[model samples]
Target: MISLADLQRRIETGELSPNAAIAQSHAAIEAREKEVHAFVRHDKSARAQASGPLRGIAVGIKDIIDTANMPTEMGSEIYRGWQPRSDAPVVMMLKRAGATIIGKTTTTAFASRDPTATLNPHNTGHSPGGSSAGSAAAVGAGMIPLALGTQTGGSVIRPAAYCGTAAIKPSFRMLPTVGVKCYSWALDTVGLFGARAEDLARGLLAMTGRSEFSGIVPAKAPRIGVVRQEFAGAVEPAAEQGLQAAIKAAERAGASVQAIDLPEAVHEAWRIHPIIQDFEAHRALAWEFSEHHDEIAPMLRASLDATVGLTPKEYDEARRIGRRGRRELGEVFEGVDVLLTYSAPGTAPAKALASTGDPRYNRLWTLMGNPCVNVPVLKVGGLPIGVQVIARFGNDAHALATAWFLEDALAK
Candidate 1:
């Protein structure tokens, strides 16, 4: 996969032209898309611009986000052929930074369950994982350098882990969600997908014009707190090995690492995440669920079915618990720069059952609204393994820098 930063560096030095960079991605899409199907629609005629920090980068926007030039089907039959008059702010930001809006990537129906035809780029037999399946698959396939995705739970990080790509579920509302199809307005935070940690940093910095990198590389070894996420349930053995491997690598590199257990309050937040998601999603997709019931995807339809029974009183109670959850979680970070946890339960669940893998580990952090980065650091049985790095709320630079730090340590 192309490195957004490296591509720009080459263009800056005249070693590669912006047009050449785009052509390279175009060539990749032609070679890979037949099997990967990472895109819902791609413009073979897409071109790169002459200026902006991301001039040589090509991007894939998840179909849930609006795009003026393409139909935003959102992996559902209900909104087929729906076109927005303008782009989502996130998409517009990428365009403004000179990244080519190459196409709309496939997404699960309304960015909910119901897997897309987009296959895992690593092993086509495996699932790419959903909601953001195509975005992760596209970057993992080296078809594009940068892509946009959103996470209500593990949509961005888990698929990126399964696809062998790096991705970030930025702090809640760090990026605009105004035009995004909401799964849980409270949980639907926008995220980015890229080939590596630096690529994500570059893409993010370009998108928001913010300082996302801590000295462009970490200043020194970071203080790390490892969380195994006991309440999330046990992970596959492969995932355990991957976490240990990452920890061993970090320790070998002289970084401080230690085990940290979540307080019961944090566990409660993880437990109630679905309640929040289900309640908001029901309203967000109310029209479709109400008027086009038959058209909704099976998984999401069942999810909505559960929503019918959720009471406003229950939702209110959950929100109250949520405040305590966030406060207690913030206390955990006071002692550690970031928490290392599982990005996915295991490798991409293969086509044997036809599914995306479990996202149990991601729900709590997403609800806490912290910055989480999935660092693809190892592989087991030919499938990628990623360890999630999470930082305190609103401290995105710390998350990105520490993730890059762990990524670098593991590389050696």
Candidate 2:
């Protein structure tokens, strides 16, 4: 697989032209897409301009995000062949930074519970986590160096973990979602996926015009915290072993590691995640729920219908509880630069199950609106699993840097 930074470097050195870089990506996609099913629609004739920071980089846009030139079916027959009049703000930003919009990747229907046909690049028999399934699979399979995804729950991180790709779900609103289909206005977050943490940071910097991640150097032995109690019962032994292996590797590399407990309020916040997510989602897609009732996927349709009974008072109460959780989450990092936890319950589950793995480990952080990075560090039974690094709100750069540091440590 190629890294975005390496691709850009080759382009800048004249070792490769922007068009040639794009052609290379197309070649990879052409060879793999039939089996991986990463892209719903790809531009075989796509070309890149000769200038800009991301010149020659090919990106996969999640189908839920609008792409003016592509069909954004959103993994549903309801929007079959649907095309938008304009690109999402982030897509425009990516083009402005010189990226080639290669194609739109598959998403769950409206980025909800429905599954897509995309398979994990690591093991076709296994499922690639959704709703960012195709974006993660495309990057994991080397079809593209970068891709855009949105996460309301574990869509971004969980897929990246299952596919063994690097990804970042930046602090909420760090990347614009103006033209993207909304799942839950309060929880949906735009994210980036790449072959490495540094590559993701580079793309994030270029797109957001943020300098915080410009020159991210590894910390001199960061203090890492592990929350064993909160997710222990839910995590598989293999996944826990992976987390333990990572902690041991970091400790051997001179980093400090400690066990930490999440505040009770923070745990309570996790329980309310569904209440907030479903309530907002039902409203966000009100028209679709009302008019397209019979056409919607049964699983997603039932999920939304179940929330119809939730009153504003209940939602408000959930939000109030979430606020308290966010406030108390600050204490999670008191003695550490970042917290380490499983990215998903375990490695990709059998595809025959027709389900993406659980997002139990990820929802709380998404609810808190903290920056999260999934560092692909461990593998079990020949499939990849990841550990996530999280930082306090707005400390995206540090969270990214710490993840990079851990990734580098694991590499050594």
Candidate 3:
């Protein structure tokens, strides 16, 4: 897979012209997008600028995020051919950083439960996971060096895990959401998918001008806390194996590891994640659901049908539980630098399952609004399972650095 850092380096050194760097991705998309379906649409004629930190980088924007030049069809017929007159804030950040916005990638309708036609880059028959399906697949398939995705649940990390790409679901609201379709106002977070932790770090720094997530890794080994997340559900052997592999790798690399338990509030937070998600989703898409009815995607339609009755009281209570959960989780992090957990239940499920695998393993951290990184560690039956590394809500730089650390350790 292409690395954003490599492209940046080559461009800075005059080894590859800006256009040449974009041409490589254009050629890749041209050659493989047909089978991968990683893109809803792409611009072969996209051009690159010669200035700024991310010059020569090519990026795929998930279709839920508005881009004036392209359609923002959220993998649903309801928004088919929908075009916005302006770019999302996240897209503007990327554009200001000199990255080429090559196309819009597929996203589940409203970034909901329904899956996209995008095939897993590792094994086309397996699920790519959603609603960040195409962004992760595009990076995983070597079609683009960097792409944007959002995670209200596990949309970004789960798909990145399934597709074997590196990704970060940044701390909630770290990136502005204006012009991006909303699922849950409190939970929605824009994130990035890339070839490696370094790529993600580089792209984020260029986009946000936040150097904390960019530069040097600390020489001290991270004090790691491991969470099995029993409250979530049982994982397939593959996920357990993947997590253990990372633990062993970290241990071997001179890091300290210990088991950590979740506070009950956190477990409660995990249980009520859907209440917050669905209640808000019902209102967030009120116009679409109220007006479009049958045109809404089946999965999301079914979801809203079952959840439309969720009262403001239920949502209010859920938010309170979530706050308590985050508070308790903050205490948990005081004793450890970061927490390690499962990125998914297992490797990508068979696409024939007609469902993206469960988000149980990921819901807790999303509610806590922490920084979580999916670092692909091992593969089971040719499908990759990523181990999630999480840090405190505001400590995104440390979260990513530890992921880079574990990623480097596991590489050995």
Candidate 4:
């Protein structure tokens, strides 16, 4: 896959035209889309002649995001052939930055538990983590250099890990959600996937106009916190081995690696992830449940039904706990530049499973609203496993820089 920076450089140097770059992506999609099923809607005829920092870049927008010119069915029949009159803020941002909107990638139905038809690009027999399956698969297969996705739980990071691509779930709301479909508004975060952390950094900078994300290469080794205890124990052997290997590699590369224990409150916070998610999700889809109830997927239907009984009191209590957890999370990074851990339990699971792989390693950070990046640093059994680098809230640049540094170290 071509790096966004490299693509931009070639375009600027007159080595590649914006239209030609987009055509290259279409060619890749035509060759691989049959097997990967990475896109729900692709506009092969779409063309962009605008020039800017992202001039020649092609991007896949997760179906849940609104796009004015394309049908945004959101991976469900309920809204099949739906078209919004305007682009989502993020989509508009990308267009303004001169990125060609190549197509809409598959998202799980309503970005919920039900998996889509998208297959893992690494190994079609395995599942590409949802609900951002297609976005990751497209980038993983080199169909495009960058894609937009969302994370309410493990959606962004897990899929990136499963597909062996780089992804960053920036601090919640780091990117505008004005036109995005809401799941758990508090937990839902706009994210980016790319061939590398540096690629993601460039995309974020272009879209958000944030200088913090500029020049994200680390100047020195970071103080890394290796989180073990409960989180590490849940990791499958292969994934754990990858995590350990990353730690050793970082240490050898002169990073300060230390073992750290998260506050007990964090464990409690993890328990409440569902409470907040369910409460918000129930209300977020109230209209769908009331009108298109029969069209909703069975798994999501069951989830909504189960949460129908949750009271305001329970929801409020969960939010209170979440707020407290956010405060305590600051202490977890006292002397560390970032916390390192597993991106998922293991590589992509067999496609036959009823669900995507677990999000046990990802939800905690989502709850705390920290910036997290999935660094694709290892491969086991011919599938990839990633190590996550999490930084304090509002310190997204550092998190990405550290992840870039780690990715570079692993490559060497």
Question: What tens-digit string does per-residue lDDT give for candidate 3 at 177-285?
Answer: 9998998998898989999888888988998898786674732589999999989768999999999999999999889999988999999999999999999998899
Q: Residue 248 deviation, candidate 4, in Å?
A: 1.0
Write the residue-wise lDDT of candidate 4 on 1-412 in tens digits.
6588788878899999988888888898888999999999888986765688888788999999999999888788999989999999999899999989999999999999998999988899988889999999999998998999999998999999999999999998878887888999989999999999889999999998888977778536889998853943577887888899899889888898988889877878888998999999989999999999989988998999888999899999999998888888898877888999889998899899967888888988898999999988778877899989999999999998898889878866
Model 1 Cα lDDT, one tens digit per residue, 96-181: 98889999999999987788889988899999988899999999999999999999988998999999898999888989997898
- Model 1 TM-score is 0.98
Candidate that would win on lDDT: 3
The per-prediction tally of clashing pairs is 0, 0, 0, 0
C-alpha displacement of 191 in model 2, angstroms?
0.4
Q: Candidate 3 regions off by >4 Å?
A: none
Q: In model 3, which residue pairs have backbone atoms overlapping below 3 Å?
A: none
Per-residue lDDT of model 2, residues 1-412, tens digit only: 6699888888889998998898899999998999999888998878987789999999999999998998888788899989899998999999999899999998999998788989899899999899899999999999999999999999999999999999999998888879889988889999999998889888988898888979876766998998854633668887888898899888988899988889889888989999999999888889888999989887899888777998899999999999999988887777788989889998898988878878778888899999999999878998998999888889999988888899889988
Task: Quote each prediction's TM-score.
Answer: 0.98, 0.98, 0.99, 0.98
Candidate 4 stretches with Cα past 4 Å from truth are 229-233
Q: Which sections of candidate 2 miss by over 4 Å?
A: 229-232
Model 3 vs truth, CA RMSD: 0.9
| Model 2, C-alpha of 74: deviation from truth (Å) | 1.8
